[PDB]
Ligand binder design. Structure first.
Ligand code: 9BI
Ligand code: K
Ligand code: K
Ligand code: NA
Ligand code: ZN
Length: 641
């Protein structure tokens, strides 16, 4: 399986710039590449990436997306003087030309194609191209918005042609609408385009009616264009994550792309003079992380915009950190999206309800100078994952996993201390072994930056859960998220706000308070889709708002775990990836799947469908019950009294 992350960069693309006065173009500077690469080197990230050389896109490759007349006209700009370059620039909107920009435009596109080849040939797991000029405004016969050729549209058209892909997701999180990409794939159902963008009721550049939520695609492509307009500035981490949980990710996992391409403009970051948004550079660690389970991890990140040199460098680093598998930073202060964002979200969900299963219940009444703190260091763990299989079982482990059954003297004293106080008449040395394992693994996870998560197979659930949870609460971990697949009650108290409990059970149970989420899904062929809808639409929003310091996963032996890998990967967005999983009984496959997802490996796609209406009803009842306490659950504007 593929390993490593490509970083594609060349300083030649910094060798064109604006040569006359134009306030609408001044911000697009060579130093955007310089500062970004240097920030990657400063933090040791470039050195851990596979450097893949740029090349020129050929004429034939350019003609995949652009007309011969437009290519021919651009091909003559290297021979033009400044006067003629200015006159040529004025034929287009918000773009400048330079003797070297045609050369750099072919490098930006070739760099992108190099990135696609590296990922699709399995030479790397994923990667990023740092390119100039950007691409996403470029159109079949026009330069636009600092873009000459459409780098990301090339990438999808090239991957279609040369790898015969049928499903490609393009995520455009630049703060501007990528209308060139939308036009390119408007009628094509094989490419799903998502864009959020500052819109302000069409008063923000490029001022297009078809940038609104109502443009869903055309003809065979209806439903495969998703526009989410931001109609106010100042959008926050909660707005962006609400967009992902309630619009993008439900559609992305249902579409099941074979490749993901990100139009990665960081002018959507705090401090940018174009976007005027408020999301922290750390949010891009999570936008990247939440998309990484798709397409077996095959993600190509392509630089678009981003103009505040500081937020630019920090956001590029958060993205590459996540591409490299480094633990995600904790996002504090999350809550409801603002009213304007909830309006945009509910409007796109409603027009998209004709096309996507996650939204189909909405269609019938029966169914329903700026400054911010510098990002903390993100260092990978020595051993990412420790594993404790039953005594005797030896397993084949990824290179970043270790067994860990060696109980120390201090740990062994705590186990009998705990036994002597809370479990008098317990003699079973198999259970006492597992509690030595839990405490030893937990202490490595929390006290060290060099073990991140772990998995322990256990005999008795009640005793193991108590010591795991209690030893975590005394460490102390301020808050603990518990995710439990099974039935019955556990020694878990949710009456102090330090624990939130997600339970996925078989019998319908009454849910009393707002620190428990109970999901009883109907047994049958549609359990997989229902679980994924619950995970993206309920579990992740609450977990992200809760912001735990540790995640405790628990599976009872009696218990449809072909989604367990996706949850384990996605849930590592919380608690900087610090998750302890307790598997009750030995299941060879479940244990290797758990270890692989905890270790950061890529997981198999889910492939195919639609969930039970009874299940969606149950899930929306949970939303109605919880969203006043946990506002990140909301995907509609609330009613004013
Ligand atoms: C800065 N904008 C491009 C951003 C591209 C980007 O970063 N894409 O990701 C262009 C602003 C502009 O030209 N406004 C305007 C247009 C016509 C007449 C008067 C004013
Ligand atoms: K966008
Ligand atoms: K499309
Ligand atoms: Na102009
Ligand atoms: Zn932009």
């Amino acid at each position: 399986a593929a390993s490593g992350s490509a970083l594609i960069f060349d300083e030649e693309m910094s060798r064109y710039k604006l040569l006359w006065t134009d306030p609408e173009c001044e911000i697009e500077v060579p130093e955007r590449l310089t500062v970004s690469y240097e920030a990657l080197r400063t933090h040791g990230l470039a050195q851990r990436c596979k450097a893949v050389p740029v090349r020129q896109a050929t004429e034939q490759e350019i003609l995949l997306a652009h007309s011969e007349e437009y290519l021919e006209a651009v091909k003559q700009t290297p021979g033009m003087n400044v006067e003629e370059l200015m006159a040529f620039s004025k034929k287009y909107n918000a773009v400048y030309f330079h003797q070297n920009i045609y050369h750099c435009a072919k490098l930006a596109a070739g760099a992108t194609l190099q990135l696609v080849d590296s990922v699709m040939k399995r030479e790397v797991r994923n990667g990023m191209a740092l390119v100039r000029p950007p691409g996403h405004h470029s159109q079949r016969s026009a330069a636009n918005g600092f873009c000459v050729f459409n780098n990301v549209a090339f990438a999808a058209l090239y991957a279609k042609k040369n790898y015969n892909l049928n499903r490609i997701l393009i995520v455009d999180w630049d703060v501007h609408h990528g209308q060139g990409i939308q036009y390119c794939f408007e009628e094509d159902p094989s490419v799903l385009y998502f864009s959020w963008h500052r819109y302000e009721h069409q008063s923000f550049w490029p001022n297009l009616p078809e940038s609104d939520y109502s443009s869903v695609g055309k003809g065979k492509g209806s439903g495969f264009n998703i526009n989410l307009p931001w109609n106010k500035v100042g959008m926050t981490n909660s707005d962006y994550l609400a967009a992902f949980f309630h619009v993008l990710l439900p559609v992305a996992y249902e579409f099941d792309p074979e490749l993901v391409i990100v139009s990665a403009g960081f002018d959507s970051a705090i401090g940018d003079p174009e976007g005027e948004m408020c999301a922290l550079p750390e949010i891009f660690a999570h936008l990247t992380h939440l998309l990484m389970p798709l397409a077996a991890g095959k993600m190509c990140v392509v630089l678009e915009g981003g103009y505040n040199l500081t937020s630019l460098g920090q956001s590029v680093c958060q993205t590459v950190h996540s591409l490299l598998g480094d633990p995600t930073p904790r996002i504090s202060g999350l809550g409801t999206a603002c009213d304007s964002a909830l309006e945009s979200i509910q409007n796109v969900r409603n027009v998209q309800s004709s096309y996507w299963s996650s939204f189909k219940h909405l269609a019938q009444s029966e169914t329903n100078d700026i400054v911010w703190p510098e990002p903390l260091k993100r260092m990978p763990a020595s051993v990412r994952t420790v594993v404790v299989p039953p005594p005797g079982v030896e397993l084949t482990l990824p290179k970043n996993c270790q067994h860990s059954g060696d109980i120390s003297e201090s740990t062994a004293k705590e186990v009998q201390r705990i036994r002597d106080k809370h479990f008098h008449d317990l003699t079973d040395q198999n259970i006492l072994r597992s509690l030595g394992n839990i405490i030893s693994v937990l202490d490595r996870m929390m006290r060290s930056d060099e073990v991140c998560n772990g998995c322990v197979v256990v005999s008795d659930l009640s005793v193991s859960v108590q010591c795991a949870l209690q030893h975590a609460l005394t460490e102390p971990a301020e808050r603990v998220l518990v995710v439990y697949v099974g039935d019955g009650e556990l020694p878990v108290k949710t009456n102090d706000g330090k624990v939130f409990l997600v339970q996925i059970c078989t019998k319908e149970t009454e849910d009393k308070c707002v620190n428990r989420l109970t999901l009883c899904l109907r047994e049958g062929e549609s359990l997989t889709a229902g679980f994924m809808q619950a995970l993206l639409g309920l579990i992740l929003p609450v977990a992200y708002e809760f912001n735990p310091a540790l995640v405790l996963g628990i599976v009872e032996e009696t218990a449809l775990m072909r989604v367990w890998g996706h949850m384990t990967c996605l849930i590592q967005g919380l608690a900087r990836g610090r998750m302890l999983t307790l598997l009750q009984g030995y299941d060879k496959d479940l244990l290797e799947l758990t270890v692989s997802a905890l270790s950061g490996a890529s997981i198999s796609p889910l492939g195919p469908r639609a969930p039970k209406p009874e299940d969606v009803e149950m899930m929306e009842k949970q939303r109605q019950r919880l969203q006043e306490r946990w506002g990140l659950l909301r995907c509609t504007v609330s009613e004013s009294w």
